Design an enzyme around this catalytic site. Structure first.
Site, short mmCIF file in Angstrom:
data_model
loop_
_atom_site.label_atom_id
_atom_site.label_comp_id
_atom_site.label_asym_id
_atom_site.label_seq_id
_atom_site.Cartn_x
_atom_site.Cartn_y
_atom_site.Cartn_z
N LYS A 68 20.14 21.27 -8.55
CA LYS A 68 18.79 20.89 -8.95
C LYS A 68 18.30 21.74 -10.12
O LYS A 68 18.61 22.93 -10.21
CB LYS A 68 17.86 21.05 -7.75
CG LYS A 68 16.54 20.35 -7.83
CD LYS A 68 15.89 20.45 -6.47
CE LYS A 68 14.39 20.47 -6.54
NZ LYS A 68 13.85 20.46 -5.16
N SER B 186 11.99 15.65 -6.33
CA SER B 186 12.51 17.03 -6.58
C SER B 186 14.04 17.04 -6.49
O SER B 186 14.70 17.30 -7.49
CB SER B 186 11.84 18.07 -5.72
OG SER B 186 10.43 17.88 -5.66
N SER C 211 11.60 17.58 0.19
CA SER C 211 12.33 17.28 -1.04
C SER C 211 13.84 17.28 -0.90
O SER C 211 14.50 16.86 -1.85
CB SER C 211 11.95 18.25 -2.14
OG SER C 211 10.87 17.71 -2.84
#
Ligand SMILES: Nc1ccc(NC(=O)OCCCCO)cc1
Ligand SMILES: Nc1ccc(NC(=O)OCCCCO)cc1
Lengths: 438, 438
Positions: free
Chosen positions: A75, A150, A174
């Site tokens: 991420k 996210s 998320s």
């Protein structure tokens, strides 16, 4: 149809392919598929190719690491040395990290090769992934639907089959919500079980925040279990659950503050029914279940304060430090109620969210959003209730695929287990997945 | 001379004695020795004897519990159902806990029998054990000297051989300092490794701890290892250190804001010099050791805020919630500094405190106190510097007996190791002990 992370590590150790070959095939999948999806928004392909050559040198030198040469992404909020960490902020688009995050350092020590970073919304504050620096990520099962929030770039990368493994963060669903929207596996870990160092707000060294956790995302539970062992502060207790018989399940298809689809309800009951047929016991109520309505009130209150770092809007008096300590007591109390519930049950079966992935919304204010529940209007923000128990209580919650709705959009199960039993959550999810093949 | 908790458990398991006999033997040792010490101030002997009889019904059932029938006491601050938990406040002398604390619950599930509870200062706010409800605990090695602070009952009860095992709490040295003052073993655990539930402020449910940890106290390192595995939230990683050869030690005998006396310096250097003789590398400086003066200042600033539960004097402003969050970032910055230091070092060797057990003081204000350091007077409160590193940084720190000063007052070594390496701290201490023998 794509190699898992463990399968990839074995294919590189086993010789049928090299770490450079594994990395060039992943790059090829990214370039051939990301166009309509827009998941891998930061790309480090040249440095990754050099890392793969270094990995093949280790493979040649008889070195064996559990994730050696496996191409993957993380991420965008996680720091990678020499890469931008923006959190979707244009103001922070040029903030380059000078050191790897703890989770990246652990995965690189396991031999993993990082190709780039996956897309996020601005400030990691939405259930979709769109921002001015990178654009929008579209669900691979339906380009008109959002790909989750996210960790949505992560889940769309796994769902599109580009990379076998990913890592997200979860303060308000998320990890679980994107895994649910994109039909992949995501593990919200026990609070404080994995370090957040390097998950810094851009241009700061502040990563620690209450309720927030970081966790693995993949297409197989074996990949989640291994990534969790690589990343946890200490080795977490492995699961001794061999099969589903004797398992005690509390099945929640209703919430006092929100609602679920009838397709979502049927899917979750089918998971409980399949385990019942495998020897588990399924209850549908319990005197020990905490007040889920009081939970989400306390949770949202503490959530608002944490995100505002204590600062108060419109000249309102700020919550006092003394009152913040009492809020932590309120949380601690709530966690003890869940310990008593988990004396009678091994897992909670409940929806991840009330419905499948919604169409793209340009409205940042959740109060101005709405959802369609069986062709009826439902409040958007009230859906946080399904997320709140595992977040507020600290418990691990697994989001695992269950099938799709009538429109081909994935529906995932949420499996909540007691604190520190993350491996039980993965293990039960694997058994549920097998029980549904029956 | 006395049996250890593991030895006691083996004698009961083998049938050398029953659990009732070991319980009666411990009660007799308390009645014979506590008179001048005043360590076991809450006595539960009749309920303990019934619990000892129950343990014998389980030995006859061949049930396997690692502490079955082992008598012990616990610090008075821990809740035991039916026993008072006052923290030394007269107003709380009649506050009876309604359920066992978690740490008590874990030890009981392992078969331990609780004879009672050991003395503490008012509000656990001193380095001596004295309060209106129970009186004062005198050091067993010199009755004119204090017995350590907040765990003094626990340390003195082990030093006198009354019980084999105890358990304390520590926010400002209250496991380590009593163990140093009485010459026993005490493990300050990694922050957040053992649950504080049931270590409640009287008439509340507020564990309320930042910088505060619970950990075992014993006469042997193997007793601490067993107590730690029984009480920790999750089984901590076992130590891989088989011997001292190759161990990197950083020895500190000075601190920029405090002082130690020569007898204390001499013992710490004797432990390192004996590890050198066994094959350990010792250094007396490191470019990576962070600023201990900034640490103790930030630690004091956080300690006071925590003890005041965020409240401030009427003439001062309270620390804001936003400023509190920044202070937690400051702490995380300091912990990461110790991570880097521990890349070059396995342990830190330093004093527990600057001096041995001082004479009983009746002056509550630490600013009106002072210590004698090799004939010279030194401020009392500055001695919080030696304790601050492991408490602020969160690291585990062991306090283990080394010897005694010229008046026979014990001196303990503090062994600081990186976070989550509590078993490494125990293991190194055991190795140092066997090196100071042969
Ligand atoms: N109300 C609300 C709902 C969802 C989110 N997204 C989220 O879960 O953030 C994960 C990032 C961890 C650090 O923030 C945020 C707020
Ligand atoms: N300023 C200061 C405050 C407290 C202490 N007492 C101590 O040593 O730790 C207390 C252990 C209780 C944990 O809840 C010493 C100095």
């Amino acid at each position: 149809s794509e190699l898992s992370a463990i399968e990839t590590a074995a294919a590189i150790a086993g010789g049928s392919m090299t770490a450079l070959e594994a990395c060039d095939a992943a790059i090829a999948r990214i370039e051939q598929r990301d166009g309509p999806i827009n998941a891998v928004v930061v790309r480090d392909f040249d440095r990754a190719r050099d890392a793969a050559k270094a990995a093949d040198a280790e493979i040649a030198a008889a070195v064996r690491k559990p994730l050696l040469g496996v191409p993957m992404t993380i991420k965008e909020s996680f720091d990678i040395a020499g890469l931008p960490t923006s959190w979707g902020f244009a103001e922070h688009a040029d903030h380059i990290a000078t050191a790897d995050s703890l989770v990246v350092s652990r995965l690189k020590a396991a031999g993993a090769v990082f190709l780039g970073k996956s897309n996020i919304p601005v400030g990691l504050a939405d259930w979709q992934s769109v921002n001015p620096n990178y654009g929008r990520t579209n669900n691979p099962h339906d380009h008109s639907r959002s790909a989750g929030g996210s960790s949505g770039g992560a889940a769309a990368a796994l769902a599109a089959g580009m990379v076998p493994l990913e890592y997200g963060s979860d303060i308000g669903g998320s990890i679980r919500v994107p895994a649910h929207f994109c039909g992949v596996w995501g593990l919200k870990t026990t609070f404080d079980a994995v370090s957040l160092e390097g998950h810094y707000f851009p241009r700061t060294d502040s990563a620690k925040a209450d309720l927030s956790v970081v966790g693995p995302m993949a297409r197989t539970p074996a990949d989640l279990a291994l990534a969790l062992d690589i990343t946890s502060k200490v080795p977490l207790p492995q699961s001794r659950i061999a099969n589903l018989s004797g398992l005690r399940i509390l099945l929640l298809t209703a919430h006092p503050e929100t609602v679920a689809d009838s397709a979502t309800i049927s899917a979750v009951e089918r998971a409980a029914a399949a385990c019942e047929a495998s020897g588990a016991t399924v209850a549908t109520s319990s005197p020990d279940l905490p007040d889920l309505s009081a939970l989400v009130a306390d949770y949202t209150r503490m959530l608002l304060v944490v995100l505002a770092r204590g600062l108060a809007p419109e000249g309102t008096e700020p919550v006092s430090l003394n009152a913040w300590y009492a809020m932590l007591d309120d949380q601690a109390r709530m966690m003890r109620a869940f310990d008593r519930l988990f004396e009678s049950f091994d897992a909670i079966f409940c929806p991840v969210l009330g419905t499948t992935a919604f169409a793209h919304s340009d409205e940042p204010d959740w109060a101005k959003r709405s959802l369609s529940i069986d062709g009826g209007i439902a409040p958007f923000a009230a859906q946080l209730g399904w997320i709140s128990m595992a977040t507020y209580g600290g418990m691990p919650a697994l989001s695992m695929p269950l099938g799709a709705d009538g429109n081909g959009l994935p529906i995932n199960l949420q499996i909540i287990t007691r604190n520190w039993s993350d491996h039980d959550a993965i293990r039960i999810g694997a058994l549920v997945a097998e029980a549904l093949d029956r």
